[PDB]
């Protein structure tokens, strides 16, 4: 029980856990150089997030090139992720970067591209061209996360409106518009979104963070847009409004993973609720054995200060305790004065929470929900984690070429590293968002074919021995596919490391 565990914790004993959780880092001005990326990889990064709501294909090509380079230098396999800009009534490019609005003021809200950047305290641009036809005089316009509300007074012109400012606010370039009445009927993928996705498939990204996903049909649209040239890239649905919470079950089934965008959620739902919502979404994800990621608002203040607030640290630790596979930084590492240090703090938080969690509880919980009879595949992975606990194995080594098996093992949440020996680099890259997992590449072309699965097993055990997981006389658990399975691993082996 957690209780017994908790009463046994000591602040004074060093911790000893090999970090299970994974860290996603957004790239931008502070971290786009190759030396920066190398320090980010050394100091814990598993996925590099390219945030397409800003920047040109040139800026993002630089990131892709630079990360592949730093990785190579380091001999790692780093995931690259594309975060879509997404359907969003947006507005920005303010003349001098900014405009301040006082209550009682009147302001022009235009859909003319001539003011698209010359947006002043009197006239600014809103990206939706149907706004004059959808908002009538009287209703409001929520600008910058419901912080700055405007009351429509008149349809001043064909594509401009004269509005009444409720509360003072400092509006910076490109802040989201959140029209309270719906019937906006927003799509799954803007025309920019689509183009960007082809750029991504064309450059070889490993996962899409699709933004503002509300229904399952839209995840399907994202898939369609990725095409067959990228039928294998992960789609990670970004849950950021109440619709996505509402349809979380359909969405989870149509996605490869989930991202809980807490600060976006926070504009429509109260904070005490957002807490609950995170517990439900992460746990559903756990049960589905899909990756789930906590994003918005993590060590926010560490963008400018050398240390976060305790409140923020507990916030991260909660995400871990709650079940999250990954934590993502967004601007802590993009524009921040302490990129590496914040990554290393995330590493310390992850290990502390991991050491602070009863190792068996999740295994037992997940196992009790499993309907019986289990499939063979399910049973193989379940009982591999169970055998691990029972013999006190120090590593599970799964040979998988797609990564399915390693994800199913990680769902059962063992208390040891999972090592995946794969023949595909894309699988190394994509496994970076699955808890406990580390991959190991067997270039078949440059070696045998390993039909007897033996040099791949050696590759795995060699990795575990050199990375401190396992020693002479330790037991390990080998999960792989037999000679005779259409697909999937169905064999397991309990081996002892030999001197």
């Amino acid at each position: 029980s957690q209780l017994q565990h908790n009463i046994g914790l000591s602040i004074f004993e060093p911790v000893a856990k090999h970090r299970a959780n994974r860290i996603i880092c957004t790239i931008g001005p502070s971290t786009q150089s190759v030396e920066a990326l190398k320090g980010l990889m050394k100091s814990g990064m598993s996925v590099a997030r390219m945030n397409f709501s800003h920047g040109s294909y040139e800026y993002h090509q630089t990131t892709i090139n630079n990360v592949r380079a730093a990785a190579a230098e380091l001999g790692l396999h780093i995931g690259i992720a594309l975060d879509t800009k997404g359907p969003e009534i947006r507005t920005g490019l303010f003349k001098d970067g900014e405009a301040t609005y006082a209550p009682g003021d009147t302001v022009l809200v235009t859909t003319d591209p001539a003011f698209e950047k010359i947006g002043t305290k009197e006239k600014f641009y809103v990206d939706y061209p149907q706004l004059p036809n959808v908002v009538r005089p009287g209703g409001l316009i929520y600008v910058d996360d419901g912080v700055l509300t405007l009351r429509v007074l008149s349809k001043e012109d064909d594509c401009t409106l004269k509005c009444h400012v409720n509360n003072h606010h400092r509006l910076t370039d490109r802040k989201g518009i959140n029209l309270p009445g719906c019937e906006v009927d927003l799509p799954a993928v803007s025309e920019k979104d689509r183009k960007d996705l082809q750029f991504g498939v064309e450059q070889g990204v490993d996962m899409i963070f699709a933004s503002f996903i509300r229904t399952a049909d839209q995840v399907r649209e994202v898939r369609a847009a990725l095409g067959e040239k990228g039928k294998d890239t992960l789609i990670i649905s970004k849950i950021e409004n109440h619709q996505g919470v509402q349809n979380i079950d359909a969405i989870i089934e149509a996605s490869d993973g989930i991202m809980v965008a807490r600060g976006d959620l926070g504009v429509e739902i109260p904070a005490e609720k957002v807490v609950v919502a995170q517990m439900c979404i992460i746990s559903k994800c756990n049960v589905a054995g899909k990756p789930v990621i906590c994003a918005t608002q993590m060590l926010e203040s560490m963008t400018t200060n050398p240390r976060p607030t305790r409140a923020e640290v507990t916030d991260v630790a909660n995400a871990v305790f709650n079940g999250a596979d990954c934590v993502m930084l967004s601007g802590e590492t993009a524009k921040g004065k302490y990129p590496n240090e914040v990554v290393q703090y995330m590493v310390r938080i992850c290990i502390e929470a991991q050491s602070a969690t009863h190792d068996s509880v999740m295994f037992n919980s997940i196992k009790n929900l499993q309907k019986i009879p289990m499939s063979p595949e399910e049973a193989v992975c379940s009982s591999a984690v169970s055998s691990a606990f029972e013999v006190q194995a120090k590593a599970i080594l799964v040979l998988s070429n797609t990564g399915r098996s390693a994800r199913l093992i990680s769902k059962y949440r063992p208390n040891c590293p999972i090592i995946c020996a794969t023949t595909r680099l894309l699988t190394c890259r994509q496994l970076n968002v699955t808890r406990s997992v580390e991959s190991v590449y067997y270039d078949v072309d440059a070696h045998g074919e390993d039909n007897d699965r033996e040099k791949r097993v050696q590759l795995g055990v060699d990795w575990a021995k050199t990375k401190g997981y396992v020693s002479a006389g330790d037991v390990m658990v080998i999960v792989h596919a037999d000679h005779s399975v259409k697909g999937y691993p169905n064999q397991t082996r309990l081996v002892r490391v030999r001197e």
């Binding site: 050394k42 100091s43 814990g44 290393q344 995330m346 590493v347 290990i351």
Partner: protein, 130 residues
């Protein structure tokens, strides 16, 4: 993972004073620990002996401890911005002649037990002649 680099030993007159310095590079990337996360101990090994606790300082400098032999004479402090630990030694006496080490523990809190430290400096000779 983290490495320590000592400087400052020598010969001194009974009653004089020296300042030992230890500079830190590197990290235990696995854990996410750096000099600024780790408590630091200072130990000494006199000729023919094992190696004994002298003093210790917690990660952020907020806690220190000293053996009675050196209380009121020795002061451990640290500058995390410069990745450096200091051991200021005043009113040195012949009984302080020994080789002196800094060591770093993967804990925010220090120990007096040498086996509980993870990385060491390579040691410097301090000789107090009267």
């Amino acid at each position: 993972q983290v490495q320590l680099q000592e400087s400052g030993g020598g010969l001194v007159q009974s009653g004089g004073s020296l300042k030992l310095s230890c500079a830190a590079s590197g990290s235990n990337f696995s854990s996410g620990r750096t000099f600024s996360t780790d408590a630091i101990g200072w130990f000494r090994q006199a000729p023919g002996k094992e190696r004994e606790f002298v003093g210790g300082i917690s990660w952020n400098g907020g806690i220190t401890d000293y053996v009675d032999s050196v209380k009121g004479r020795f002061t451990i402090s640290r500058d995390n911005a410069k990745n450096t630990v200091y051991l200021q030694m005043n009113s040195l006496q012949p009984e302080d002649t020994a080789v002196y080490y800094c060591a770093g523990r993967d804990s925010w809190y220090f120990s007096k037990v040498p086996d509980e430290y993870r990385y060491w400096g390579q040691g410097t000779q301090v000789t107090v002649s009267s």
